[PDB]
Amino acid sequence: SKAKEGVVAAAEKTKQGVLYVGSKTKEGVVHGVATVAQVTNVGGAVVTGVTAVAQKTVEGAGSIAAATG
Amino acid sequence: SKAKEGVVAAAEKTKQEGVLYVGSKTKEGVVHGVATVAQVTNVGGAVVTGVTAVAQKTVEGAGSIAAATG
Amino acid sequence: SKAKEGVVAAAEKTKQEGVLYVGSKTKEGVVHGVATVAQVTNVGGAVVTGVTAVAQKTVEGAGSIAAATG
Amino acid sequence: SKAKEGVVAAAEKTKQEGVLYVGSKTKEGVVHGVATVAQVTNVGGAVVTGVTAVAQKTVEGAGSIAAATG
Amino acid sequence: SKAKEGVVAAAEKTKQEGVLYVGSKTKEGVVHGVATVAQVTNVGGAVVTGVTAVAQKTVEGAGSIAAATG
Amino acid sequence: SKAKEGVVAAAEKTKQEGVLYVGSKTKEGVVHGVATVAQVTNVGGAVVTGVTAVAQKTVEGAGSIAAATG
Amino acid sequence: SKAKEGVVAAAEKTKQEGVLYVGSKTKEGVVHGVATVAQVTNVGGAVVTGVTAVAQKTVEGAGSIAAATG
Amino acid sequence: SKAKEGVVAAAEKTKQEGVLYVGSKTKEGVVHGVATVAQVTNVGGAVVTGVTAVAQKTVEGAGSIAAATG
Amino acid sequence: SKAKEGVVAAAEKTKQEGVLYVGSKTKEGVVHGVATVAQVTNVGGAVVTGVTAVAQKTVEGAGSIAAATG
Amino acid sequence: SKAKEGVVAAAEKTKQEGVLYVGSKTKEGVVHGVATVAQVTNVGGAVVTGVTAVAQKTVEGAGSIAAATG
């Protein structure tokens, strides 16, 4: 009895400045997340560009659980 | 008895000057944010994509992803 | 009786003039952030990709990744 | 009974003029952040990739990665 | 009964003028951050890659990695 | 008594399945043809100027360019 | 008494398959033809200026270019 | 009494499956043809300037260039 | 009496499957033709300037360049 | 009486499967043809200047260049 499952228990969180970005381009090609022709979780930040800035980003209580077959 | 299942349990949160400037000047931008050509794709946090991509204070709290397969 | 599972228990967090300047100038950038050509890919912290990539104070607290295989 | 399991228990965290400047200039940049051509790939801390890549005060606290094989 | 497992219990953390200038200039840059061509690949601390790569004060506190064979 | 003359004396001629093929393909070309100032110019042959310039059997007989300046 | 003359005596002629192929493919070309100043000029042969310049059988007979300046 | 003349005196001619192939493929070419001044110039043969410059059977007979300056 | 003249006399001609192939493939070429001044120039032979410069059977008979300066 | 003259009496000609193949492949070439000044120049034969410079059968008979300068 094939059963390609995935057994997941996942979370908790019980709680109780200047930024400047200047840019100039010409003829840019960007591919953020591709898939050509197999899972792809994301639980934190994925930043993609020609200029990519990430500040104070991934702060607290993440969970990723994957399964397969 | 094939059963391509997935046993999910994913949630909890029982919680009891600022300047941002972005100036840009492009020419001929070709952007593909999230593609799929011819298999699942979860997202539980930020996915930023551009020619200029800024992300500040984004993912804070109780982020949960389960996955299974077919 | 195949069962290609992933047995997961994963999280918790129980709590109780800064200047950033980025200046750029390009010509003919070709950027591929996360590809897959023709295979799991978890992401639990930051993935930053560009021609200028700056990450500050990013991954602080309670990250968990569990994977399986078939 | 072939069962390519991954047995995971993973986390916890129970708590109780800074200047950054980045200046760049390029011509003809080709950047591939995370590729896969034709295989798990966990990520629990930062992955920074560019032509100029700066990571400051990044991975501070409670990270866990668990993998399996098949 | 081949069961290619990975048996993981992994974490804890129970707590109780900084200037960074980076300037650059290139021409015709080709960067590949993390490739895989044709295989587990964990990451539990910072992975920086570029023509100019600066990582300051990054991996500070409570990481854990565990993998399996195959 | 200035006299900044010019004597031009220039003419006479007392005369008693070839295949040509040109293909061109351009993206974003820019031409300037003969002149720009911020100064005479006598022409009696071909001045051919382009991104693809072909001149076949052009100047034949009694080309008689005269010039004089002061 | 200045007389910044020039005296020109210049002409006469008392005269009693073939395959040419050109293919050109360019991208982002820039051409400046024969002059730019910020100054006499006499032409009687083919002045050909291009990115692909072909001149066949051009100057035949009594090319009589004559110039006299001050 | 200045007289910065010139006696210019020049002409006569009393005359009683060739395959040519050119292929060119360029990217980002810049051509300046003859002159960039910030100055007499007599021409009576072919002046060919390119990134591919072919001159066949050009100057035949009575090329008669005459110059005189002051 | 300044007289900075020129006596130029230049004339006469009393005349009673060739395959040529050129292929060129360049990238990022820069050509300057004959002059960049910040000055007499007589031309009566072929002046060819390129990144591929071919000159076949150019000067034949009665080429009579004549110059006189002061 | 200053006379910075020049004198020339010059010409005459009283005349009563060839395969050529050139290929070229370059990258980042820079050519300057004959002059970069910051000055007489008589030309009587093929001045061929290039990265690939070929001249064939170029000068034949009665090229009777002359000058008398200063």
Short mmCIF file of C-alpha atoms in Angstrom, two decimals, chain I residues 5-69:
data_model
loop_
_atom_site.label_atom_id
_atom_site.label_comp_id
_atom_site.label_asym_id
_atom_site.label_seq_id
_atom_site.Cartn_x
_atom_site.Cartn_y
_atom_site.Cartn_z
CA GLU I 5 52.64 79.28 -54.38
CA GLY I 6 52.68 75.83 -55.97
CA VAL I 7 53.25 74.71 -59.57
CA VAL I 8 51.53 71.36 -60.07
CA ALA I 9 51.24 69.71 -63.50
CA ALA I 10 49.96 66.20 -63.56
CA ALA I 11 48.52 64.32 -66.56
CA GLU I 12 48.17 61.89 -69.21
CA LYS I 13 47.45 58.37 -70.57
CA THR I 14 47.08 57.86 -74.34
CA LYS I 15 46.15 54.18 -74.38
CA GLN I 16 45.48 53.16 -77.99
CA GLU I 17 36.62 33.03 -62.89
CA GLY I 18 38.43 35.50 -60.66
CA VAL I 19 37.11 34.71 -57.19
CA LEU I 20 37.49 37.05 -54.21
CA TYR I 21 36.10 36.08 -50.81
CA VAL I 22 36.17 38.06 -47.55
CA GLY I 23 34.56 37.01 -44.27
CA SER I 24 34.84 38.93 -41.02
CA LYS I 25 33.46 38.44 -37.51
CA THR I 26 34.45 41.13 -35.00
CA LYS I 27 33.26 42.27 -31.58
CA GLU I 28 33.84 45.74 -30.07
CA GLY I 29 36.07 47.32 -32.71
CA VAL I 30 37.10 50.97 -33.02
CA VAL I 31 38.48 52.48 -36.24
CA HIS I 32 39.90 55.96 -36.91
CA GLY I 33 40.39 56.68 -40.58
CA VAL I 34 43.17 59.11 -41.50
CA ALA I 35 43.34 62.10 -39.17
CA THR I 36 42.79 63.29 -35.58
CA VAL I 37 44.37 66.75 -35.30
CA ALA I 38 44.15 69.14 -32.36
CA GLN I 39 48.80 70.16 -42.69
CA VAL I 40 48.54 69.17 -46.32
CA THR I 41 47.54 65.63 -47.28
CA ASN I 42 47.67 64.48 -50.90
CA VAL I 43 46.16 61.10 -51.74
CA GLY I 44 46.42 59.38 -55.10
CA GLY I 45 46.92 55.77 -54.22
CA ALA I 46 44.41 53.64 -52.41
CA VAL I 47 44.33 54.39 -48.69
CA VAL I 48 42.59 51.43 -47.07
CA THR I 49 42.10 51.18 -43.32
CA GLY I 50 40.09 48.57 -41.51
CA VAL I 51 40.03 45.63 -39.22
CA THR I 52 40.11 43.62 -42.45
CA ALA I 53 41.55 45.69 -45.31
CA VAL I 54 41.95 44.12 -48.77
CA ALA I 55 43.17 46.07 -51.82
CA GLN I 56 43.42 44.31 -55.18
CA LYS I 57 44.76 45.76 -58.46
CA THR I 58 44.53 49.32 -57.20
CA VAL I 59 46.86 51.83 -58.86
CA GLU I 60 47.41 51.32 -62.58
CA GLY I 61 48.68 54.01 -64.88
CA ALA I 62 49.15 57.79 -64.76
CA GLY I 63 48.90 58.35 -61.01
CA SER I 64 50.38 61.78 -60.64
CA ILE I 65 50.24 63.07 -57.06
CA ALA I 66 51.73 66.52 -56.89
CA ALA I 67 52.20 68.66 -53.78
CA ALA I 68 53.77 72.00 -52.98
CA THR I 69 53.54 73.69 -49.60
#
